Design an enzyme around this catalytic site. Structure first.
Site, PDB file in Angstrom:
ATOM      1  N   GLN A  65       0.804  -1.223   0.000  1.00 34.02           N
ATOM      2  CA  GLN A  65       0.000   0.000   0.000  1.00 34.02           C
ATOM      3  C   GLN A  65       0.846   1.287   0.000  1.00 34.02           C
ATOM      4  O   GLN A  65       0.334   2.377  -0.297  1.00 34.02           O
ATOM      5  CB  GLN A  65      -0.990   0.005   1.171  1.00 34.02           C
ATOM      6  CG  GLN A  65      -0.371   0.262   2.555  1.00 34.02           C
ATOM      7  CD  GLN A  65      -1.354  -0.006   3.688  1.00 34.02           C
ATOM      8  OE1 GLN A  65      -1.612  -1.155   4.041  1.00 34.02           O
ATOM      9  NE2 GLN A  65      -1.906   1.059   4.257  1.00 34.02           N
TER      10      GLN A  65
ATOM     11  N   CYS B  46      -5.329   0.733   3.322  1.00 33.74           N
ATOM     12  CA  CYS B  46      -5.385  -0.735   3.765  1.00 33.74           C
ATOM     13  C   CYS B  46      -6.764  -1.338   3.575  1.00 33.74           C
ATOM     14  O   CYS B  46      -6.853  -2.449   3.171  1.00 33.74           O
ATOM     15  CB  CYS B  46      -4.871  -1.085   5.169  1.00 33.74           C
ATOM     16  SG  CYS B  46      -5.529  -0.118   6.466  1.00 33.74           S
TER      17      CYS B  46
ATOM     18  N   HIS C 148      -6.197  -1.178  11.410  1.00 36.42           N
ATOM     19  CA  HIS C 148      -5.560  -1.634  10.158  1.00 36.42           C
ATOM     20  C   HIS C 148      -6.257  -2.880   9.583  1.00 36.42           C
ATOM     21  O   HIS C 148      -6.429  -3.891  10.263  1.00 36.42           O
ATOM     22  CB  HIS C 148      -4.054  -1.869  10.393  1.00 36.42           C
ATOM     23  CG  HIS C 148      -3.297  -2.388   9.202  1.00 36.42           C
ATOM     24  ND1 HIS C 148      -2.838  -1.570   8.188  1.00 36.42           N
ATOM     25  CD2 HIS C 148      -2.873  -3.635   8.893  1.00 36.42           C
ATOM     26  CE1 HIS C 148      -2.201  -2.296   7.288  1.00 36.42           C
ATOM     27  NE2 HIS C 148      -2.209  -3.553   7.689  1.00 36.42           N
TER      28      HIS C 148
ATOM     29  N   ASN D 156      -1.145  -9.347   4.521  1.00 42.15           N
ATOM     30  CA  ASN D 156      -1.005  -7.924   4.777  1.00 42.15           C
ATOM     31  C   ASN D 156      -0.627  -7.194   3.488  1.00 42.15           C
ATOM     32  O   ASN D 156      -0.266  -7.827   2.498  1.00 42.15           O
ATOM     33  CB  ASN D 156       0.029  -7.686   5.881  1.00 42.15           C
ATOM     34  CG  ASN D 156      -0.162  -6.348   6.603  1.00 42.15           C
ATOM     35  OD1 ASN D 156      -0.947  -5.495   6.179  1.00 42.15           O
ATOM     36  ND2 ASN D 156       0.563  -6.166   7.699  1.00 42.15           N
TER      37      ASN D 156
END
Length: 220
Positions: free
Chosen positions: A19, A25, A162, A182
């Site tokens: 990102q 996110c 997040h 992630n």
């Protein structure tokens, strides 16, 4: 339910993304979930556009690089009648003007989305056994940030600051874990992924079970 699930092993997960210097996110989590259900329902893996969500999916609550909500991500895709590809609407890590022509190119669509009942790892496990699931967790702590290997057991808070995507689960050494994709690129964690403790109860590890949702496609 199965003892082990790994959506990567059946080609339902696009390679790890980054990102960058942008709190987008929420968009990476939305997309990774959408990518996963498309593969599951249609048999094709297509990398989809985070930028499109950043630029074109602004709401009162969802604000490009200043954070947002996967539920708004799914809604935009539903309302738009689909989402363009990563290749056609590439990621820039800045908030740009919505490209209406690119917004009109629809390669993947979803019918609906659902929320997992809050604070219910069992219900989360049920959803993950069927597809990748968008979740938010507390990722600001030193230990989460410097995680590189093993099963993460904290310490972490429980504020959902997040978004990530659950792409599986399993057990190792008697310790249950979730597999988390992630969007900090491949140099973080286990080449971009984290195994994080599962079956701890309540809000889940780092609040992972607080705000889970997944997109729906009616037909397989």
């Amino acid at each position: 339910l199965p003892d082990y699930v790994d959506w990567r092993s059946s080609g339902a997960v696009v390679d790890i993304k980054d990102q960058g210097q942008c709190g987008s996110c929420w968009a990476f989590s939305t997309i990774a979930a959408v990518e996963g259900i498309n593969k599951i329902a249609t048999g094709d893996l297509i990398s989809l556009s985070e930028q499109e969500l950043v630029d074109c999916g602004r709401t009162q609550n969802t604000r490009g690089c200043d954070g947002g909500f996967m539920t708004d991500g799914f809604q935009f895709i539903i309302n738009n009648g689909g989402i363009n590809t990563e290749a056609n609407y590439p990621y820039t890590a800045e908030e740009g003007q919505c490209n209406l022509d690119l917004q009109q190119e629809k390669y993947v669509s979803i019918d609906t989305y659902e929320n997992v009942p809050y604070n219910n790892e069992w219900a989360l496990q049920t959803a993950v056994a069927y597809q990748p699931v968008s979740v938010a967790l507390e990722a600001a702590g030193y230990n989460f940030q410097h995680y590189s290997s093993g099963i993460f057991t904290g310490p972490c808070g429980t504020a959902v600051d997040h978004a990530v995507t659950i792409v599986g689960y399993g057990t190792e050494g008697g310790i249950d874990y979730w597999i988390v994709k992630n969007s900090w690129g491949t140099t973080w964690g286990e080449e971009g992924y984290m195994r994080i403790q599962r079956n701890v109860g309540g809000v889940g590890q780092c609040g992972i079970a607080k705000k889970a949702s997944y997109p729906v496609k009616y037909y397989n």
